[PDB]
Design a protein around this ligand. Sequence first.
Ligand code: ZN
Ligand code: ZN
Ligand code: ZN
Ligand code: ZN
Ligand code: ZN
Ligand code: ZN
Lengths: 85, 85
Amino acid sequence: MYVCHFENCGKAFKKHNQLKVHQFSHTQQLPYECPHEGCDKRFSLPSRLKRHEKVHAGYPCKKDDSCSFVGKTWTLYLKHVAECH
Amino acid sequence: MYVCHFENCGKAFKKHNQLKVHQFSHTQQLPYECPHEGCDKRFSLPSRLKRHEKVHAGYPCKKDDSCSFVGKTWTLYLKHVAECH
Ligand SMILES: [Zn+2]
Ligand SMILES: [Zn+2]
Ligand SMILES: [Zn+2]
Ligand SMILES: [Zn+2]
Ligand SMILES: [Zn+2]
Ligand SMILES: [Zn+2]
């Protein structure tokens, strides 16, 4: 089965095209797609997309796979790495 | 900055605890949490959680990291692997 990854859904469909058509119900409401290849993040406002693209530009913590820290600068990244985990 | 991973959000906070408090606004609306360790999936209905747990029990496609197929049976998994990608 093809399973919908959108939040609070998980509806499953026998055929891939049925999932794609279903998913239009989500993407219509979230027209602003992240331009990075492989990233499935979408938003309903341009400002939220822009904020998200700035996060891509930063320095994500990979010490912990649970950690949601993304440093705006290299200084703040190395400080985080030293003080956490 | 600590960045919120919930859909259509991405709000960022200087401190980890500020993100956690913010995230209560999401989790209050999605009370049904997946019991699998490492899985952040949440739902607003018990039926959606149950469906999601059944997906965990199945056979996820790992030929493609984009593919959303999860086989209900081993037969259907190997058929998918042969006919796709
Ligand atoms: Zn869906
Ligand atoms: Zn992105
Ligand atoms: Zn971290
Ligand atoms: Zn949020
Ligand atoms: Zn799960
Ligand atoms: Zn596949």
